[PDB]
Amino acid sequence: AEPPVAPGLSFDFYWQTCPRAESIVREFVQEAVRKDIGLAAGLLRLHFHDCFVQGCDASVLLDGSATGPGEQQAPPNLTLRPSAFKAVNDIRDRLERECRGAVVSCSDILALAARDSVVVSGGPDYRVPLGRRDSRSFASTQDVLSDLPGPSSNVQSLLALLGRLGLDATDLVTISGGHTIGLAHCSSFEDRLFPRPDPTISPTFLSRLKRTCPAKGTDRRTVLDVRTPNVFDNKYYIDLVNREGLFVSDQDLFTNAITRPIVERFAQSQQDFFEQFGVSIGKMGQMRVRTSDQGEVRRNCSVRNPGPG
Amino acid sequence: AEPPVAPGLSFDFYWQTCPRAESIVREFVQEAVRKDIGLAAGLLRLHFHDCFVQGCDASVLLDGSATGPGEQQAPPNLTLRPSAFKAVNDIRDRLERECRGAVVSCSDILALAARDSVVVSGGPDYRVPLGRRDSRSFASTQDVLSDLPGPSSNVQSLLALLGRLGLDATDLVTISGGHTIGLAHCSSFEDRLFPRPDPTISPTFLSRLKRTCPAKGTDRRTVLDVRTPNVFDNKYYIDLVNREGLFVSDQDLFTNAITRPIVERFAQSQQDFFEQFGVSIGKMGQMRVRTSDQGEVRRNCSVRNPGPG
Ligand code: HEM
Ligand code: HEM
Ligand SMILES: [Ca+2]
Ligand SMILES: [Ca+2]
Ligand code: NA
Ligand code: NA
């Protein structure tokens, strides 16, 4: 289906101003991901990360923002892929060239690139509402701490957070499917291994995880989806059913009575998952967006447009 | 004379790496100032401003820093010239091209551009110690408030602040000579007019100032040096002797017994002023600098070099 459109946004927002905008972003992503498969996961996560930190307003792309491109102090689980930040900037440049001006916002680029990353990885092609404006407000560590969901959080905590932000249980289970591709550093799940193992981890999976992260503090990464690491599909839900979810936030989806039925549904039908994904990710991608007068269209995603006004 | 060199810095720091660096900066400034005379004042003040806020480390050039290029909330007296930020970036780009790589730091560019701005405005040609590194730390409003001297401050307060930062009374009187060029917004001196006029302002000058700023809150600017607004010379000291200094920080230099003799000396001999300027501005330009491992060489002055390390 198609996601509900928030006030101010619309599909084909650039139809008149820059009709080929979406094609340019896709063509760039296709080539970029071909050269670096992990870029797809990076871009997809970047969109998610940004959306939760203050809203889908490209705030985390700013150098002045916590977890932004110049961040070197944050732990592995809070540091985004450098190539993801770079890709967005490159796309922005290419778009300015194509549109004969800075018409497309970095916020929209994030939404489009994420969609294309999914498509390029074998996922569903869904429509993306456009018209978001870029924020001139930097994200503080406080913003990150209060709005960004952590991997150690259970479904109860996540439903509360997402509830405040306008997403329901279905959205939670659905957007969590983003973990069907990508990597995770030991630090993000080592607490499920030490001191004592999480009883929800299947014995076989535990042995595997202990090999990857022999002790707390191990500097190593592993795949989020043990079955198909780089293919966007429903295998992530099958992992959960088999007690092979990496994070507590992953596995608890199968443990919790409220989310369990949805997990089982998606595990049984990839089509059910794909159809719902475009809707739920569409809703996530419209959280607290800046419209028209609320933001600007950056000439460089890393910085706010210079000038007194 | 030549200013004392701080540990880590040296004249001709780029002699081997990029010998023509200094020539490129001058040539750019000469042309840029020709097109926009006010740019000289902008660059000169930018160097001063940056040096006091945390140290001569180009921190204020960062978009993430208070009073930086993206600042739109600060009052007129705390907003630097947009063209000054732009010029520095342009110089940095030209230098990367010339040096065949990002060799020269933005911090050094600030020091050189300031020197060239003085020279182009008819001032003395002095040697500049080089080798400063760019900071990865953003300046907070707190940093600005505690280290940046305000126009309402008297000599007693200024000597205390500068004393902590390694500058003496001579340095104060000398670097204050920077006000021999440039502009100031009514907000920076309106407190000397309303509610009751500052008795140190000569009657004639007061009438003039009241015309420029009829009431508190007037959005208008005036020249810092009523005699030669755009020429770098000792006329600023002559203004002080005639009770025609714009700021309290200006006029009090003549009022205070400690600084008065130096003001009178410079008013009588421009040569005495010019010779001392290169030394004092040299000292100011080396306050709390980052050397070798302490910073980086930005590929873009507005942002910290992206990456985990
Ligand atoms: C709301 C629950 C979520 C939590 C708690 C969460 C947490 C995390 C964490 C901690 C990492 C691993 C970082 C590391 O150790 O390197 C990660 C990676 C990832 N997440 Fe999520 N995530 C969630 C939702 C999402 C959503 C909505 C998407 C987007 C559809 C998404 C896409 C990804 C991707 C693709 C990666 C891999 C990134 C890469 O390989 O660079 N996540 N997530
Ligand atoms: C330490 C005492 C100083 C104080 C309190 C001070 C204060 C200020 C203030 C408030 C302005 C006016 C801003 C406005 O209203 O638009 C200004 C402008 C200026 N200052 Fe200073 N200043 C000082 C030292 C310096 C130094 C060391 C230099 C450099 C040699 C300098 C160079 C300038 C220049 C050229 C301008 C004009 C800038 C322009 O036209 O854009 N100042 N200063
Ligand atoms: Ca997969
Ligand atoms: Ca003058
Ligand atoms: Na954001
Ligand atoms: Na500074």
UniProtKB/TrEMBL annotation, chains A, B:
User: What family does the database annotate?
Assistant: Belongs to the peroxidase family. Classical plant (class III) peroxidase subfamily. Belongs to the peroxidase family. Ascorbate peroxidase subfamily.
Its biological function?
A: Removal of H(2)O(2), oxidation of toxic reductants, biosynthesis and degradation of lignin, suberization, auxin catabolism, response to environmental stresses such as wounding, pathogen attack and oxidative stress.
| Residues carrying the site annotation Transition state stabilizer | 45
Coiled-coil parts of chain: none
The encoding gene is Prx5
Q: Which residues bind Ca(2+) 1?
A: 50, 53, 55, 57, 59, 71
Concerning CDD domains, the annotation shows: secretory_peroxidase
What the record notes about the co-factor is: Binds 2 calcium ions per subunit.
Identify this protein by name: Peroxidase
What reaction gets catalysed by this protein? 2 a phenolic donor + H2O2 = 2 a phenolic radical donor + 2 H2O
The species this protein belongs to is Hordeum vulgare
Which of this chain's residues are annotated to bind Ca(2+)? 180, 225, 228, 231, 233
Q: Where does substrate bind?
A: 149
Q: Which cofactor does it need?
A: Ca(2+); heme b
